Symmetry: D2
């Protein structure tokens, strides 16, 4: 594919799941990809194996550790991208956590780590990438991976849903601030995205059937289901799209019981 030929794409949280699938598809569309990961041993291992898979089909990618909760990570990722590839053209902000926990006994540290990682870290990663895009003067695209939970509630996600709605709101306000520099800012809202079914347990499979019944398309999402929408929003197919959000949920949001 050639939707992102000669663009440098940073993807945060890209060692597994949606970010992994997005980074891969960006590389398949001709981009040179900075695979950001958490800096953990599993994160590094997944980032490097993705880099290998990309190298195998002729792509170009590097892996960069950068804990999203560390607010210095944005400039570290931009610096690594500019050092290796000379530019930053697309940011896919995807790193996040969702430690389910009840509201009335939520500890401060868990709440603050969730906001810190999902929203504050995103803020300054977007800021670092957008600064570089403005300095280049060639435009850019920023995509925040948020969630259907940006639009509705979850009882075990009182600390989590505000960060997802926060991300949507950040893209709306950045769209105004960065529009004069040709930088488009949008959000994708994944619904229920499943992990590999061959690795699930029997109990995990029984919950899969109930959640699947809730989706009009008749199946849970896969990480690759988010790659097309992310690459669309990063590309010239979306040349007039900014300040927008896009549900990628198989109809889950509209399917009121």
């Amino acid at each position: 594919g050639s939707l992102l030929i000669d663009k440098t794409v940073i993807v945060t949280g890209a060692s597994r799941g949606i970010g992994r699938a997005a980074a891969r598809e960006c590389a398949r569309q001709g981009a040179r990809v900075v695979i950001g990961h958490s800096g953990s041993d599993e994160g590094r291992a997944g980032a490097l194996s993705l880099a290998e898979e990309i190298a195998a089909f002729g792509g170009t990618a590097i892996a960069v550790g950068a804990d999203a909760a560390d607010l210095d990570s944005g400039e570290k990722l931009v610096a690594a991208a500019v050092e290796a590839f000379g530019s930053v053209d697309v940011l896919v902000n995807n790193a996040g956590i969702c430690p389910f926990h009840s509201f009335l006994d939520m500890p401060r540290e868990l709440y603050l780590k969730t906001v810190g990682t999902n929203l504050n870290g995103a803020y300054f990663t977007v800021q670092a990438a957008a600064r570089r895009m403005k300095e280049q003067g060639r435009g850019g695209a920023i995509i925040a991976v948020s969630s259907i939970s940006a639009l509705v509630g979850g009882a075990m996600q009182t600390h989590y849903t505000p960060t997802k709605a926060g991300l949507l709101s950040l893209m709306q306000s950045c769209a105004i601030a960065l529009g004069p520099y040709g930088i488009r800012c949008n959000a994708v809202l994944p619904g229920t995205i499943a992990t590999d079914i061959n690795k699930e347990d029997l109990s995990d499979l029984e919950k899969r059937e109930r959640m699947t019944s809730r989706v009009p398309l008749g199946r849970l999402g896969e990480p690759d289901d988010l790659a097309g929408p992310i690459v669309f929003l990063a590309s010239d197919m979306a040349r007039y799209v900014t300040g927008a959000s896009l549900l990628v949920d198989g109809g889950l949001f509209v399917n009121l019981q």
Copy 2:
């Protein structure tokens, strides 16, 4: 080549967004049915687009089918099936916005706006969706709605409910038609420079005022909707249904 071997029906495709979407689908490999109003101007515009498409190697036919006539849906599907053997994508785009104040709104003006923009769309969607279910191969439906689906307009009290109604139709059809692999979504164009508003935008002081409200710094053009429509019609959007997508250069978020 996102739509190779797909039959695409575009309603109201002789001018504006519909014309650009029909041409782009054809460039992506689709066989395109160019639906128009049946008027003399509609027929001429659809004819010229069909010739343009044929000139770059694409395939298209032109079909008159007044969107206000509830028989038009089956006529378009029958023409598509006769010419190309299938219906795989519907881009519902025919619509009118006769600006008029609310307190003196004529009943027949209101009824023609709802009849064209919403009622005609309902039964065009129904006719295409039936064929798609019958084929058993899935499909995609894209309603061209508007930013006006989300906010108000004092001279559009008859019009904004049809745009919001179209979005809602896509949400409910996504549920009804999801088990058949038929995805239903809406695009919400912002301020698009077309033939309808060309005289209003001739006022270049007005144009600069309208332009200053768009963060991307320009008004839209019909090709700005072509990419998002083809995306929603394609396998890039295989898990997208019941969704809406603003295509407005940031207009909606830019609270003045």
Copy 3:
């Protein structure tokens, strides 16, 4: 005296579809708040009987009301209701548009006649009832309030409601556009969005105790709504408590919309 409120004292309120359900409860509470109420009904035998029994109850607790038959699908009904209100009470100050139908039906075999009756009753008839009321409010020069009773279905889909959800979304959009058009005349326009409300309509879905238990378990507040649960929000939007509220919508659903499952 009956511990009547005064939020709507000296105001004339037209309620369409007021013989039963949400409309009946709204009309009753407006009268408890001091309003003179036009109890609009469909003209059917059942509608007329329900409107008369409400008028008897209101009269007995010291309120003021009249019953007026006015089929919402007849686009002349808006002017009929306004004329009755002006003749009986001298003004029109609040419109609560509540008349509507939801004949559940699948999409692919939806008949034209059923679809067109649903749009005609729920949206077209509301449009010209709002128009007739708003013209009288403008002519009076004392402002007013319009409340459309829409539905949570204005925000989400329903497979057996492809003909119905667009009319509910359309009503919300109508309030947004009318808020702009009528704001200069002091007329505020808002929509209320009820969730699952146990009314006579969904009598037979709720007849199934197992279905009813599942529907109740989806509401965070833990119960289905009652028509009286909509009376307070409607009266609020009609009153000076909401003097700066226009172009707005209000979910009244016990948390159903936010409770993603």
Copy 4:
């Protein structure tokens, strides 16, 4: 008598919307905890409000409790319980909007905005809700958010996410606290003339431009939010939770 004998905690109540909401709660029979920042101006405003309320026969106390200090929620609850025996309503209103461009936003300013507007709200809601659950009599929580929860602002990249986050917090808390009869809702004020925007509103030309964008034809006053807040706090809203209410004179829908 919408709130007779209820204990209402209002944060940020020395001025503006919070001050008017605290006053109206007391006019409805509530005993009011006037939360303020602890600054000299916060202390003076809270005292004058407490005296205002006392002068018309109400009951109130003032409590300094910086919303950025995450201990403040339990400080307010403890003061409410000692003075008045219960907590029944929380109006979360404390917030800041230090306008600043995005690309040079300092970390300290961003973190103080999130910390005050969202993090402090979270743990104030948590403290109030714990006490409401222990009492077993239900309760009401109202977050004062903004129209900016729905749209963007170039000089508010740090601010609008906190306002949208407040709305989302009420949505999730409505689910978690529903079983305990605790309703959670947000109000979204439009352009409200307060001490914050006071200097910008002395420019007569700009005030006219901002007024012309409101369909009701005037800017809001703090009293304009009091009615909606007391409504959401009361039995008039007994089936309302997880909901949001624009209080903006039509500003949001009035697309240019």
